[PDB]
């Protein structure tokens, strides 16, 4: 899902 | 505050193309999901389709694949979409959506709208 | 695709009155990727549910969502004058987002 990306992107972008 | 500022109406020929800018401020550009919506006059929401920014990752509905471009630029904050061959049934209003945030969490769904840009396609 | 329907297109109700506004999936949203919008003629939609039953700060809470898998609910507990307007559901539980075709909340008189 395309509309998932960016809450990875910010979960990936704390740790 | 997040704030979207859409370039002004404008008036297309019939099988012209147009572009539509969305000048963003207030937040982080780059890193949240930006997407285009169209109302056609008297008619419903129609999601187009949507650019992540830093990612160059664009997600197109159906049935504007091939028709249409979205493009992020990040030195100006600015998200353009492009609609091509212009139809009478493209008269609309387009507004652009950014999804909302819980600098912090993203939501999916658009928490902040541009005023909207009237395309009319006529001759 | 998955398609949203909303059905009455138009509620009539007084001022007061209580609404439930529904809005059935053809198959299921993924994660309750579900949210409800607002709007008033003249102006951009206003994002008032979020993921089922997420409320934005500043939306008043007299609108709640509920619902999950294909059965969704916009509950509206007391309309203020301000509430007579369209909503519209949106799914992004998948790729292709998709929007209903949106109830028009009328006052009856």
């Known amino acids: 899902n395309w509309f998932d990306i960016t809450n990875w992107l910010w979960y990936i972008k704390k740790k | 505050q997040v704030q979207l500022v859409q370039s002004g109406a404008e008036v297309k020929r019939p099988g012209s193309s147009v572009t539509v800018s969305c000048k963003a401020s207030?937040?982080?550009?780059?890193?949240?999901?930006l997407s285009w919506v169209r109302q056609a006059p008297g008619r419903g929401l129609e999601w187009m389709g949507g650019?992540?920014?830093?990612?160059?990752?664009?997600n197109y509905a159906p049935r504007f694949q091939g028709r249409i471009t979205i493009t992020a630029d990040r030195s100006t904050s600015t998200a353009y979409l492009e609609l091509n061959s212009l139809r009478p049934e493209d008269t609309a209003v387009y507004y652009c959506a950014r999804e909302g945030t819980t600098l912090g969490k993203p939501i999916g769904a658009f928490a902040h709208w541009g005023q909207g840009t009237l395309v009319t396609v006529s001759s | 695709e998955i398609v949203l329907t909303q059905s009455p297109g138009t509620q009539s109700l007084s001022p007061g009155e209580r609404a439930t506004l529904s809005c059935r999936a053809s198959?299921?949203?993924?994660?309750?990727?579900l949210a409800w919008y607002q709007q008033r003629p003249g102006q951009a939609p206003r994002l008032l549910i979020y993921g089922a039953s997420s409320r934005p700060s500043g939306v008043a809470d007299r609108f709640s969502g509920s619902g999950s898998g294909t059965d969704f609910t916009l509950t509206i507990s007391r309309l203020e004058p301000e509430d007579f307007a369209v909503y519209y559901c949106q799914q992004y539980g998948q790729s292709l987002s998709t929007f209903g075709q949106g109830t028009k909340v009328e006052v009856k008189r």
């Open positions: 207030g937040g982080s550009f780059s890193t949240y999901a």
């Open positions: 650019v992540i920014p830093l990612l160059t990752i664009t």
């Open positions: 198959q299921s949203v993924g994660n309750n990727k």
